[PDB]
Each structure stands twice: as structure tokens, then as C-alpha cells.
Design a protein around this ligand. Structure first.
Ligand code: EB7
Length: 133
């Protein structure tokens, strides 16, 4: 038989939602600080770039990524969520940050460059989190 299964092809999943009209939302000073100070300083860092958008498993050649990571998260998604006032409190936003870092440590091993980048950002994240209102 001549069907060699060259199609159907692989793909990336739909990225996480940055809007939800029915979701409860607020603008708190902690959430404003998370956008104004915490997100924007992590975003400017030289190790930020791999975390600034959802993982493209096809482009980056990580076809096992969404087999292992079932709750993906990135700083681009958190930035859009903060800009759209998507969160109810700081805990929801901080949990997204925690998910992003945890995904990186689950998927990769100690010593990998991406983990060294994640640890540096987490170190810096936790310092900025200590100065929350
Ligand atoms: C945090 C998202 N992320 C990963 O977990 C991950 C593992 C392996 C490669 C890449 C990746 N590919 S990449 O841009 O070529 C890259 C970035 C930093 C690095 F140290 C190594 C690679 Cl291969 C982008 C985003 C992620 C990964």
C-alpha cells in the first residue's frame, strides 16, 4: 500500500487565552506593579527572549514539548493578560509565572542553558516579588 503516513502533519496547540469576557477581573496596585515593575524588568533581561512567546514546537524542533507540557505558559501571554486586565488578583498572575518556570524545569535537565536562563529569571523574579505592595 502506497500510504506512507507523510500526512497528516504535526502542529502547535492553540496558545493560552489572553481574553475572557465572562472571567472576573480587577485592577489592583499589586497587578499594576506586576506589569509596571516585575514583568517589564524580566522582559528587558538578556535571558528573557526564549520565554517571550509560546513555544513553537515545529520551528524549534521540540516535537515532544506538548506531549510532556500540558499546561504551557510564557511571558508574552502574561504580558497580554496584564495589559488586558485579565487577572482578579496578583496570585493568578504569579501562578502563571510559577507555571512557566516549572514547565522549563520539568521538560529540561539541570545544566541545560535554558534551565540556567530560567533560574536567573526566577532568582530575579523572586527578588522583585519580595518588594510587592
Ligand atoms: C522555556 C521554553 N523553552 C524550552 O523549554 C526549551 C527547551 C529547548 C529549546 C527551547 C527553545 N529553543 S531555542 O530558542 O533555539 C533555545 C533557547 C535558549 C537555549 F538556551 C537553547 C535553545 Cl535551543 C526555545 C524555547 C524553549 C526551549
Amino acid at each position: 500500500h502506497h500510504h506512507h503516513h507523510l500526512v497528516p502533519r504535526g502542529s502547535n496547540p492553540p496558545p493560552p487565552e489572553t481574553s475572557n469576557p465572562n472571567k472576573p477581573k480587577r485592577q489592583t496596585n499589586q497587578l499594576q506593579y506586576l506589569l509596571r515593575v516585575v514583568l517589564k524588568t524580566l522582559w528587558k533581561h538578556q535571558f528573557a527572549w526564549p520565554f517571550q512567546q509560546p513555544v513553537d514546537a515545529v520551528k524549534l524542533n521540540l516535537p515532544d514539548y506538548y506531549k510532556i507540557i500540558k499546561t504551557p505558559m510564557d511571558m508574552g501571554t502574561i504580558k497580554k493578560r496584564l495589559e488586558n486586565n485579565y487577572y482578579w488578583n496578583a496570585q493568578e498572575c504569579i501562578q502563571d509565572f510559577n507555571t512557566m518556570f516549572t514547565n522549563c524545569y520539568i521538560y529540561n535537565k539541570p545544566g541545560d542553558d535554558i534551565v540556567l536562563m530560567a533560574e536567573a529569571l526566577e532568582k530575579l523574579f523572586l527578588q522583585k516579588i519580595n518588594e510587592l505592595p
